[PDB]
Amino acid sequence: AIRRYYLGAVELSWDYRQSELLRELHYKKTVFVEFTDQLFSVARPRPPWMGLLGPTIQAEVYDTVVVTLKNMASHPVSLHAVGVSFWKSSEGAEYEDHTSQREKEDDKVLPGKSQTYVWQVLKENGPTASDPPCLTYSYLSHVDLVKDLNSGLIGALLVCREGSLTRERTQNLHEFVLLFAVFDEGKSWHSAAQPAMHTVNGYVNRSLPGLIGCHKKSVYWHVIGMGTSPEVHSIFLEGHTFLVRHHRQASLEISPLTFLTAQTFLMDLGQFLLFCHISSHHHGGMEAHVRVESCAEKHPKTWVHYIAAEEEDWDYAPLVLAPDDRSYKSQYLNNGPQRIGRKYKKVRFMAYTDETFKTREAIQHESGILGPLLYGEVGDTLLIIFKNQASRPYNIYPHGITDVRPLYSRRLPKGVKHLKDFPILPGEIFKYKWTVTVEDGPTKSDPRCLTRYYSSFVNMERDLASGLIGPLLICYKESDKRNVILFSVFDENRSWYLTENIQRFLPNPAGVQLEDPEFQASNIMHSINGYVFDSLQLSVCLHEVAYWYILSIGAQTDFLSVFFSGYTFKHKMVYEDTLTLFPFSGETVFMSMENPGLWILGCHNSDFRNRGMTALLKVSSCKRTRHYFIAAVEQLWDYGMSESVPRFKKVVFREFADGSFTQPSYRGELNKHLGLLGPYIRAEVEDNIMVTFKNQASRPYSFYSSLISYPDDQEQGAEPRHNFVQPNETRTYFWKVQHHMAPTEDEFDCKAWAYFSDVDLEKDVHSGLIGPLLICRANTLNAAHGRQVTVQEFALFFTIFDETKSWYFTENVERNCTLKENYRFHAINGYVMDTLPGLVMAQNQRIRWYLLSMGSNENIHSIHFSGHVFSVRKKEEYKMAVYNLYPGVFETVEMLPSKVGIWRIECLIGEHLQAGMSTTFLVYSKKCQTPLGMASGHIRDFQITASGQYGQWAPKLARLHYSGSINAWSTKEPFSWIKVDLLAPMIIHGIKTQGARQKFSSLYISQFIIMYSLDGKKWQTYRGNSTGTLMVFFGNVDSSGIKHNIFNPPIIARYIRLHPTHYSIRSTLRMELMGCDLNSCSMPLGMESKAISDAQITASSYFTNMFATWSPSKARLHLQGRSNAWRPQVNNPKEWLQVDFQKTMKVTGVTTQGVKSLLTSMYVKEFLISSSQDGHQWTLFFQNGKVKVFQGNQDSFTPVVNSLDPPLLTRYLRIHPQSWVHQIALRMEVLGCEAQ
Amino acid sequence: IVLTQFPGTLSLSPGERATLSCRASQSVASAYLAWYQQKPGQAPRLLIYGASSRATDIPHRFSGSGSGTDFTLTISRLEPEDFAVYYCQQYGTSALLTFGGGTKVEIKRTVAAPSVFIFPPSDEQLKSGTASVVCLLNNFYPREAKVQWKVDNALQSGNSQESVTEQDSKDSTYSLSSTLTLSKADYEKHKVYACEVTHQGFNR
Amino acid sequence: QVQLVQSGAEVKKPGASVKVSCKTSGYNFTGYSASGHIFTAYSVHWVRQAPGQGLEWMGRINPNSGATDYAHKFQGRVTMSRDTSISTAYMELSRLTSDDTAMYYCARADNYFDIVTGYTSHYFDYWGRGTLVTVSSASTKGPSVFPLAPCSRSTSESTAALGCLVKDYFPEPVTVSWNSGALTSGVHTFPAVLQSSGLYSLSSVVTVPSSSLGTKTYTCNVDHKPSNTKVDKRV
Ligand SMILES: *[C@@H]1O[C@H](CO)[C@@H](O[C@@H]2O[C@H](CO)[C@@H](O[C@@H]3O[C@H](CO)[C@@H](O)[C@H](O[C@H]4O[C@H](CO)[C@@H](O)[C@H](O)[C@@H]4O)[C@@H]3O)[C@H](O)[C@H]2NC(C)=O)[C@H](O)[C@H]1NC(C)=O
Ligand SMILES: *[C@@H]1O[C@H](CO)[C@@H](O[C@@H]2O[C@H](CO)[C@@H](O[C@@H]3O[C@H](CO)[C@@H](O)[C@H](O[C@H]4O[C@H](CO)[C@@H](O)[C@H](O)[C@@H]4O)[C@@H]3O)[C@H](O)[C@H]2NC(C)=O)[C@H](O)[C@H]1NC(C)=O
Ligand SMILES: *[C@@H]1O[C@H](CO)[C@@H](O[C@@H]2O[C@H](CO)[C@@H](O[C@@H]3O[C@H](CO)[C@@H](O)[C@H](O[C@H]4O[C@H](CO)[C@@H](O)[C@H](O)[C@@H]4O)[C@@H]3O)[C@H](O)[C@H]2NC(C)=O)[C@H](O)[C@H]1NC(C)=O
């Protein structure tokens, strides 16, 4: 059960120049090492290829983990766990947690300082069999993430199923880990050429000493990205099949920090290559030779496909869709002195019906450049005849194919080695055999349709750019046909025969300097299938559902964000807004075409869409009206007051409820956090969305949520939906959301979308016009609140905002300053670190967030649930603890905050995290609500302030239960403001107050509003519980009323000030707050009650006889009766009381109180504290190196509270009084909670 | 509650700062104290609200200050458009309201020669039955120059009346007229008719 | 464009009750209960001002709920009421006294508020013409106007003052023009003063050198609207 590890931080010298360190266990790097003894002397025998990776960490359900991270390195290190629960054991971060200095350790560590970081791994952390086989987080190090992970500190925190401690079937292959990483050595302090290095477990190109795989075994591979900058790279095994359970997955993917658990079943032997399948100029060298060795000792049918490669002239603009001749059009669809032109000659695959390969097929339009479709089934015996007719030897070889072999021979005895590079001379004809498996048993829920392609490998980087593409389909059955889309960038510079094109098309090749941007960009043309700049039409009849197979092979050198306007395309059981494809990968998209109109495609990228990579679809023809009078208002926005001043004019969505746009639905409690966002457009099944958008500002914008639909006005015609709502002009986008958008039963309760001004995405998301849509299943959003009320939800929108990328940059040159770097704000919901309020949630209540990313290629911000881990519900039940954000994807997540106190909502990417994509969030405890102590005198009289005494009527006597003559806060002016200057921000759970009596008149306040503030300048009225602009508190109507006031969303502030509205005669009130400290710990455990057994409380001596019954257990707070206190047998200064707590408890407050008996008052005035574990070891509670001598009480009725910043420890807590008044007796009760 | 304005009346050449102090009995916030302006024979106007902030479309020439029990309205430069009677005042709250003493603001006028006229009731007045002896004085110094119906060591009081002209909005002039409300015989019994004349330097 | 119109000059005898109206225009009848303390122009504040003294409060009426307060002097002397939908406030001044002759205005509280954070208004920025209320037990009296010319045997100064006295006339308002409007130079009008007789006295003069100039129509005109009389008299 219990696990324990003595890790450590070792400096070492690694210049990456010398690899294959076979003599290990012996640039500057700081790496995790593992030892085996408390002396930290002898290292555990470590495998020689871990390179720069730390150890591996196992765990199970409820299995504790005890890291002991000693800092041996020459500069401060830390520990930073991911996906495992604790209590400020391993927060790592230097930020505003507001915890006692006992927990401030992890922030900075001097050399040595072994420390101890314990985590518990509860049930919500540990997975099951149905969950992913073994969760694979990385327990990184955090004190300055960029330099910490440029120093190599990283590890593999694995957690999975119980029962794996025993080496029964778990020691197999030792569960070795893989860490595709991008280590930046240049920008560390270890400097005064150091390029970034792509590595696989720290080992650069092909020099990874021997990952050893098994012949015929299903193995789990554990992949952890690493990186502080964006950009990603796919991972491929050259000759190994990629299939996992029911996931139609072929490319294993990573991202600057992401965790994956691949599963691969091996059948063959030998050596393969782990390959970064990108031909980057400086990258793609993250290759490692994997070796697979011996670890230990029907419907058959005959089909043929004729296909031949030959050259042909193709244009991507079959029509003259370039009216403009100078703005970005003619440079890529016209021919001239410094540009290649419109149509070029490329070599394709086309079919020929005859054996002699003479008669071409009736090649159809819109199927440009792509080859014929292919299809196979169970028992297929397809054989493929290829012929070359081009000026070069070319060949085909499918990607990830099940089996590919030559024909008519077991092997080719001639000078042909393999089929992977065997060329075909001009005119020669060859035959290939592609075959699939046989013994794949039916499942009825297996991945039946998958998409891949085929190209040429005489020079892949030139074959793909030369046009060497054909499709390939794998579907199972046990109009109906559709051409596929191929997203690509075809480069003439990397084309085989650019010289032929330039000599044929440029009128004179005198000089182009080979470096002019226009010609170079024209070489790299962006194509959707074989077309660019509005050259597609995919009109398909309505009603019939659509099956598309969408691929992205080309030279895009980044990720895609392909989006369909007007529809959402069914993923595996989910309907997404925009979909992402890595290059050399694709997927089977399902769709419905019940929505007519004018719809255009695109990459959604800011620049790729403007590159003519658009295409048009052009389908054409073949209960309660839920209002949202949303508007677009202009605000002078300050992205944050941390490290400096952002004051830019931004535009934002604000919801209303009345036709007169007069109430901008002020940001109160729940909607405090939306920052630059807009309103929660919620809806259910069958509902009707009456969204009466209005617009403002100098420039008109509009509204769009992937659900708008142009009514089919002007039949026998088609135009884009007008939208584009002019200044001061309104519209009404009233539409009916369809039932195919409902999240499944297996899916989360309510899915979420993103809506924006689609008129120009790239220029107004930087202006902030973005907002969350919330389509939720069935009837689960009843009541006037229009929410599930069961779950508290919030909106996370991670995006970098660039002033130069917004309309208001000209308006934002106002401050004295010259580049976009000074105007980049890495915002979460428009606020950059330590600035986003409104994030408060209940620990007992499950909560939900709405995570989105909008924007450029940079927008790969990862999200880490700091201290929490949950279960995803897609298809089946799985678990996860770190999430990605692909631009355009709006996704629903959950992280129930069982651990109370401040936290962080973590963004992993080191460049971003040091830029500000994370800002705090606090979960409190509903157990603690004790009064802040206005009546106790703890809040002294000087703090409270108001105006208008005039009668010696100070407000300083506005405390509850106060009595005697003039005993309250009174003014005759109807406008008054009583300021409970708390001076320490805490969690205000409610207010309790009564009226006053003067002579015979009764005076009070019948109705009032509350104003709470943390800084004393910004001041917001409590607007919680919705159903109103703000809450008008039901005041008191009598001086003796029982008023049970609570706050549904509890205030978090340090000024809670009472503004009265309706009152009688005058204002004369006495008020007492109910609250708790920010960390939600200060609460009596139950010493006053019987939570502590009487046998646990004992005394050195206790006055017990026939008349005196002063037992030690009678020292409970507020105990009344015979000997309602403890008295000793002999009243001497050496007396002392023991209370047992059974273990160490954190106590920060102690309440002491005198007693009264025999018509006299008795109370101890001198006391000291001590702690012990067994009563033999003697440790006094050190208090600044002395024992503090208070005066203490002055009567026996008022209990006083004293704070202990260092929490007391041990199971035995000892109080030693010194001097007393009239006898020795006290009443005691402590305040605190559980911590370690 | 009780508001007092210091000074009671001030005369100043246009364009110069003028300061008017307000004193109360009650320790009141400066929010509940403001300053109004009234042109003679007209409705007044809001000038400064909250004792520190200026109201709608008023130039930054004016300002306010003070708190608690002492307030001050300060006009950096005053023009005849604003030469008026000004009121510090507490308003609205405590369910009761009251205004200030109304310090009339005047324009300094050079010391010129005053004009004096005296007219006994002529014959038409005598046969009208109203034999009112009248004396008027104009463009004088000071405004409060008090004259009385002095006849042969005899007071005439409790029966006369006096009309005082409002300060001129252009020349800041002043004029006073004293008339007797008495019958013919009451005038006829006396023989000498005159009202006393005071300056810095008639038959039946 | 907000209007706070009031009725014209009204004359009543002491001991009765005179009711003056204040019709509001330019706002919905209520501005909410100041639940947010935002727009408080609903509160109509009465005020009166005498010729010989500064303005002094009368009362407050809230149209939203009908609540009201009064100055301690007029608890039983002034009463307040609101219309239903005509947007007009009604004040009734009872137990009239002869000193009540004055100018009566109506107000509301709409501008700003300068406190820590509060945007209500407790300041008057809206204000009508002003109702002239005349209270006296005497009935209406005509233009007992008499001329005031320099004595023929005492006319030697270049400058000579001419006047006309409207005496014992009643009630207000009464106008006097000079030279029948032919000349405005040196034209002055003394304010009405309540004589010991209880009726009004007014004097209008011209200080132009009438002696220096020849015979000119120094015929001053007296206009009494309550009695509908015009008297042009040459001095
Ligand atoms: C892992 O292997 C990959 C192979 O795919 C390798 O990529 C290539 O590395 C070489 C490293 O030399 C790169 O060469 C660069 O380009 C110029 C012009 O060709 C070279 O001359 C340079 O090499 C010089 O470096 C030495 C030290 O400065 C010189 O003293 C000497 O004269 C060398 O000529 C320069 O490094 C090349 O661009 C890449 N990319 C390719 C070939 O596509 C990758 O670098 C390897 N990883 C590591 C960490 O070495
Ligand atoms: C579409 O958008 C908005 C509709 O809300 C509107 O822009 C706003 O117009 C108002 C006026 O209609 C602007 O208010 C101004 O505020 C300044 C602040 O000092 C005042 O000085 C202005 O008043 C002056 O001008 C008035 C008219 O000439 C005078 O009567 C007055 O006495 C002043 O001299 C004025 O009230 C407000 O600032 C803008 N806001 C924005 C964000 O633009 C716009 O006009 C609508 N229509 C069109 C065609 O755009
Ligand atoms: C602007 O001024 C207007 C007055 O000039 C002021 O009055 C508002 O009038 C509307 C319309 O009547 C009131 O709206 C109410 O809304 C509630 C629901 O919240 C309804 O139940 C009300 O209906 C009542 O009347 C029916 C017919 O008599 C009854 O059968 C029914 O049972 C209800 O009793 C009514 O429609 C609105 O409440 C008032 N406002 C106030 C403060 O009372 C309006 O408030 C002013 N606006 C602002 C912003 O100041």
Side-chain angles (χ1 to χ4, degrees), chain A residues 314-315 317-319 362-368 483 531 535-537:
Chain A
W314 200 245
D315 198 354
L319 296 321
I363 56 164
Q364 76 143 94
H365 205 259
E366 171 275 327
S367 282
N483 300 272
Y531 296 95
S535 313
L536 263 84
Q537 46 266 358

Side-chain angles (χ1 to χ4, degrees), chain A residues 13-72:
Chain A
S13 311
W14 205 333
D15 48 357
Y16 268 125
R17 318 212 332 274
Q18 190 275 340
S19 179
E20 325 150 295
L21 294 293
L22 199 56
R23 292 319 80 210
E24 270 287 81
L25 198 134
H26 162 276
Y27 307 132
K28 289 264 293 159
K29 298 280 189 65
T30 75
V31 196
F32 283 10
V33 305
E34 172 154 329
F35 299 96
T36 199
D37 45 9
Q38 301 73 18
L39 271 283
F40 284 51
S41 64
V42 280
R44 197 80 173 207
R46 89 182 312 193
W49 95 94
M50 272 316 98
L52 213 73
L53 204 155
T56 200
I57 294 190
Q58 312 325 112
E60 286 181 7
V61 197
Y62 302 111
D63 268 24
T64 319
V65 178
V66 187
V67 166
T68 323
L69 190 147
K70 176 198 285 195
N71 160 27
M72 192 305 278

Side-chain angles (χ1 to χ4, degrees), chain A residues 117-131:
Chain A
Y117 304 64
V118 55
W119 322 290
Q120 209 35 73
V121 196
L122 258 282
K123 196 168 44 193
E124 319 97 310
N125 315 69
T128 76
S130 303
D131 318 331

Side-chain angles (χ1 to χ4, degrees), chain B residues 31 34 36 42 44 46 49-50 52-53 87 91 95 97 99 119 125 136 159 162-165 175-177 181 203, chain C residues 55 57 69-70 105 111-115 122-124 127 146-149 151 153 161 167 190-191 193 195-196:
Chain B
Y36 287 5
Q42 293 149 75
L46 178 35
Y49 84 92
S52 60
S53 185
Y87 331 122
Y91 26 71
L97 198 154
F99 292 88
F119 186 37
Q125 322 286 336
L136 211 157
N159 167 269
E162 39 209 12
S163 207
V164 55
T165 53
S175 189
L176 191 43
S177 65
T181 296
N203 45 341
Chain C
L55 70 167
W57 209 62
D69 282 326
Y70 313 103
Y105 316 89
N111 46 315
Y112 306 116
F113 203 13
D114 194 10
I115 198 69
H122 270 323
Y123 307 63
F124 313 142
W127 260 10
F146 303 130
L148 290 318
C151 305
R153 25 79 173 182
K167 194 198 183 304
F190 280 81
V193 309
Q195 307 159 89
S196 312

Side-chain angles (χ1 to χ4, degrees), chain B residues 36-159:
Chain B
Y36 287 5
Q37 163 215 64
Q38 192 256 0
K39 205 53 42 173
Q42 293 149 75
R45 190 171 67 142
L46 178 35
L47 192 87
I48 288 190
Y49 84 92
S52 60
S53 185
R54 282 180 299 282
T56 308
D57 323 318
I58 174 64
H60 309 334
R61 301 149 47 244
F62 293 89
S63 69
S65 63
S67 65
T69 46
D70 171 51
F71 306 86
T72 279
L73 154 71
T74 282
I75 169 64
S76 54
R77 60 211 61 80
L78 180 56
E79 321 76 270
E81 89 166 309
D82 281 315
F83 271 88
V85 195
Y86 287 84
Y87 331 122
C88 74
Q89 58 96 0
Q90 193 251 0
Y91 26 71
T93 45
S94 65
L96 301 203
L97 198 154
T98 206
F99 292 88
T103 294
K104 166 69 178 180
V105 182
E106 321 189 279
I107 300 94
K108 200 274 174 185
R109 136 192 60 197
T110 36
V111 193
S115 42
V116 52
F117 318 95
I118 172 177
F119 186 37
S122 53
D123 73 86
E124 47 264 52
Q125 322 286 336
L126 306 187
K127 342 323 174 200
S128 82
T130 308
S132 283
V133 199
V134 58
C135 46
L136 211 157
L137 42 82
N138 212 331
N139 45 77
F140 27 72
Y141 267 174
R143 171 195 172 183
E144 294 91 323
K146 186 73 171 88
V147 302
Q148 214 275 347
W149 280 88
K150 278 331 319 166
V151 176
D152 294 337
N153 306 325
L155 286 318
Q156 322 206 8
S157 193
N159 167 269

Side-chain angles (χ1 to χ4, degrees), chain A residues 366-503:
Chain A
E366 171 275 327
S367 282
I369 311 193
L370 44 85
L373 315 164
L374 331 172
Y375 173 47
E377 279 201 307
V378 175
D380 52 345
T381 83
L382 60 175
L383 311 173
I384 318 109
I385 329 180
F386 163 78
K387 178 187 180 202
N388 175 12
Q389 280 102 309
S391 313
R392 269 283 310 300
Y394 292 149
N395 197 341
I396 79 174
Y397 204 47
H399 261 191
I401 199 60
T402 48
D403 185 21
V404 48
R405 268 194 58 84
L407 201 52
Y408 310 124
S409 184
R410 173 64 179 181
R411 258 278 310 141
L412 262 198
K414 63 166 166 282
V416 174
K417 309 314 171 313
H418 207 276
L419 206 46
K420 63 70 167 173
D421 269 349
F422 153 66
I424 306 297
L425 288 309
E428 191 174 18
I429 294 175
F430 199 72
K431 291 96 173 188
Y432 319 83
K433 166 183 172 181
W434 299 338
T435 318
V436 316
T437 185
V438 181
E439 306 106 331
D440 45 341
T443 316
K444 303 300 197 297
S445 309
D446 64 1
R448 104 209 201 284
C449 285
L450 177 141
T451 88
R452 27 201 171 151
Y453 82 114
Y454 58 84
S455 74
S456 200
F457 326 81
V458 294
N459 196 339
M460 251 295 298
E461 88 149 75
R462 301 200 81 80
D463 286 320
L464 268 190
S466 301
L468 263 281
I469 310 88
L472 199 178
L473 201 63
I474 314 90
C475 273
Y476 193 28
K477 281 293 183 182
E478 299 138 9
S479 302
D480 262 348
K481 308 314 291 193
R482 274 281 300 91
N483 300 272
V484 309
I485 300 174
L486 182 297
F487 293 92
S488 51
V489 164
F490 298 120
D491 173 44
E492 277 79 82
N493 310 117
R494 286 184 262 162
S495 171
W496 264 130
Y497 31 68
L498 176 53
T499 182
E500 185 219 289
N501 298 304
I502 59 184
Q503 67 95 359

Side-chain angles (χ1 to χ4, degrees), chain A residues 606-622:
Chain A
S606 147
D607 310 14
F608 284 171
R609 301 186 84 256
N610 209 117
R611 284 269 321 107
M613 188 152 189
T614 57
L616 301 62
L617 179 62
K618 294 311 310 153
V619 49
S620 183
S621 190
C622 52

